[PDB]
Amino acid sequence: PNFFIDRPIFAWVIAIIIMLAGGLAILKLPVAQYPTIAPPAVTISASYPGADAKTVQDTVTQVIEQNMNGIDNLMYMSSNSDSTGTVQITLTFESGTDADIAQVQVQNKLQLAMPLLPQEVQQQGVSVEKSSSSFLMVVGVINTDGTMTQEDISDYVAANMKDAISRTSGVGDVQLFGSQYAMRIWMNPNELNKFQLTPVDVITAIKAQNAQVAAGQLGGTPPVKGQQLNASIIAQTRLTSTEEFGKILLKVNQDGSRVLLRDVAKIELGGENYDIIAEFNGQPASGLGIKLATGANALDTAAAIRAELAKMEPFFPSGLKIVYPYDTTPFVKISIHEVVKTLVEAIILVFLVMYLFLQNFRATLIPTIAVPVVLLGTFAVLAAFGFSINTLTMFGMVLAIGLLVDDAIVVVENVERVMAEEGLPPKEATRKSMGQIQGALVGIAMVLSAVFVPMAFFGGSTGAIYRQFSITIVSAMALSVLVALILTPALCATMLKPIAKGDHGEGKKGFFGWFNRMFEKSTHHYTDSVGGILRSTGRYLVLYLIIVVGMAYLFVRLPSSFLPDEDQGVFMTMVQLPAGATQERTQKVLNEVTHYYLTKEKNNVESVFAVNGGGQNTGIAFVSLKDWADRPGEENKVEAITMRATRAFSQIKDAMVFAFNLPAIVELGTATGFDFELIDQAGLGHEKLTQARNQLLAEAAKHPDMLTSVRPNGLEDTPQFKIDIDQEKAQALGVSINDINTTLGAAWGGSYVNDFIDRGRVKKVYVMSEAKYRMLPDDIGDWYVRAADGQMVPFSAFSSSRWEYGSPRLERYNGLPSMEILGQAAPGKSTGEAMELMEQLASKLPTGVGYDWTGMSYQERLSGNQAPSLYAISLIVVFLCLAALYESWSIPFSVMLVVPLGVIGALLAATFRGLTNDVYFQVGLLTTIGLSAKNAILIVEFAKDLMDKEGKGLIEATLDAVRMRLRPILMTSLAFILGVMPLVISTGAGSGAQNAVGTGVMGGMVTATVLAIFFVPVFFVVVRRRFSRKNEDIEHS
Amino acid sequence: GADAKTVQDTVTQVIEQNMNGIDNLMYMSSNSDSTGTVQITLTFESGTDA
């Protein structure tokens, strides 16, 4: 400490080093919008072509669910069984488990369930992936001159782009939206009936005439003695053209005429699946979902990708352009550039205050050197603990600017003060003064990390969010202190200009300086009156409690959030059609939306990206917005935008169309809102479970005062068509049940049969009915089976037919049949309360109706008992720290009593600005407690030291302290309030967060000082008047 | 028994294409054989956990 005061250059070297390591941790540091925040989930997705919901549930799912045992750190297992034939089992794991090890554990338990699976499933593939929902980017590809359809493009992507993007550096994963080329063979059932043939033969023939076969080798090993030719055999080669697939022979007739495939069915290169069809401004487009690599730079991955695509552009088909539907990146560009704008500015502000307050250049260059260094160094402290330049850590630094600023200031001010007071040289003034603030600065570090660290040890995804802030902030802080002990004292004693004893630069200059008297006089006024109050303090206790209570009411009556919403230049709208509607009708609506946006939002919307899929019944539309710059208004912002969209599609539409903005943390809890699981426990039936579900919907429909918008999260039972095969009639007339089945299948379901080699890439061979002969129930009739004898038999000869109900989506939670009920709490009431009333209502249900919690309300049912404890620790540790610094159990109470003085402001700040008690308002709120405590501690320190090291009296010593201490206090807070204010009143991108930090902090700061510089004195004085007896107000020694 | 240009765009290239976002991949090189063997070597940054 002192040591450096006598060594300017050694400190210069610790400084130069910190600057360089931070500079390096800057040059080689990851940037991303957020950190990994969400618990790890691994999803097993597989599909069973043609299967219905109970099919996959009873063929694939339950066999997989039962084979999923003994996998490490299981949290919860939830799966969808779809009538679209797809089944997905998401296993979410314990927070901070090794993604990669858990995911390997699952793919190796599945690789054991594999042999107990359907062969259709086993051959379409059962897959394992790690589930983020956070694609860095989604690239679209289109053709301008109407040239190709969706499926053509899908292929172009899968054979020209997906492959070179996953070669773009910075790109961690590529996923594909659409379906690759396939040999699509569409049976015409009549022309099939002619030659007395079935699908089954079509399959057979196709496998037979199309294959590779293990050929072998001429002159193989061992060859015979002397042998001289050694080379490979080329055999039956898989088919290449659609033509060659036409020229495959199905039955050679008697009359010399041959029957080809070309004849019995139509043949075309077509889509592997037509569930999902995608339209970008109406033109057909096919797409890519790119995920950011682990540790990789978001902004550079995206730029490298864009460079990859322009570099491919000299090789494209005509009018085939790349489009960029979703890019989370430029919002991150603006976020980063705006937080830097803040840091630079707030530095410039502190210079401005420091000058227009010490009117002395070389002093004013000191704190300017200081914090930059603390910055750089903290980036380097983060890089050491494995972090990245992301949202949470950067607003952690913005938030930290205050402790940083007060720390540099405290020092240079104390020096200048001691010089103006006693007339010491620069150096000797420093040591006097550094020797005065030393213990205080160390103690403040122990108390500041006494509040800032407990919050790092928060659990769950919530806890993760806190971890980012807490580490950013604490390191910035402890460093601000080591800088304040090594560098600043060194830069003070070395380059600070010496001040004439009893200078105060009063009057003196005119142009620039009338202020000094005017400040001077007033600080006198101030302290006169400080004294003035210290006569009767009682009234001031009255008002104090009043402020406390007011703070309480303000606190409770303020809205509890999780984060703020961000117009990200992009949002989405989702479309729900009447159950069983058509690909084409859903598509009508999606076009309607596409046009609405392309009409009454001509100035804001650049592009609409509609996707029909997940089952004809429902479509979704990705709405992209024009750049922020040409969207000025309060109305050209997403809130009002989605307002008018949903306003449009609510009344004047045929099916439900919500328009919404995606939250910034893309996968956690809607604050007041839960995710209920209604779990069937006993050997019950799906019918009984639904009955229980609507029953609970009713029990909550009875409580509009507690719960709000309680809704199930599934699909209802739709009418499904049942074709009962009478084994007797069919086995009688001569048709093998296999044949009736797989003909019914390969007719209406479709069938993967063979593999063919298109343009050198292996694609699939799908044979199914032509569209028209497999649409309507009566058409069942056009299909016949060749019996054992040789006769064709219609299905109505051995098939009964009826309509029934069934559900398209069979949900399972942790093994058993279950049903997901989403919900949120009433306007007034806390989420947990509504969760509790839900546990009381799901307790009101019939035998076998159990309940459980998942996702959001799980992450909250964990960390709902932790919040008070970390802060009980925080209070015991801060008090212990201050008792340490001083020498008192009771003197601390002076500085702790300050905490409210900042709160009353922040609550008042948000409320009277109409905001909400979120995280940013909280880290900010803490930050405020931090300064309250700092200033108060410096006052109390100076008070005690004057008292003990100069035997001075109480009232007089505190008075003197609060007096010499005022000028810097004001400096600090002036520097802040100005630096923060922009954050409080900015628009453009991200202004939701910015304003969230700002408002709370600012209001807090204001009440903080202009309440402390009157209450702290009274604390120290009134507190001290519950200590010992004799002596006193001594004035001796 | 299959031939090299046969195996390579069906088995080699199809596997290589999925090998992105491999942590610390330095360089990736693979052989496609008419003796039927197909082999893909992934060499990594010095000291990545094998």
Ligand SMILES: CCCCCCCCCCCCO[C@@H]1O[C@H](CO)[C@@H](O[C@H]2O[C@H](CO)[C@@H](O)[C@H](O)[C@H]2O)[C@H](O)[C@H]1O
């Ligand atoms: C950076 C600018 C700071 C300077 C501006 C602040 C100066 C004035 C702020 C004072 C706020 C508290 O208000 C102050 O309270 C005490 C009363 O308790 C008054 O003081 C007076 O009243 C009480 C009587 O009840 C007496 O004990 C005391 O003899 C007398 O000083 C002050 O006249 C008043 O100004």
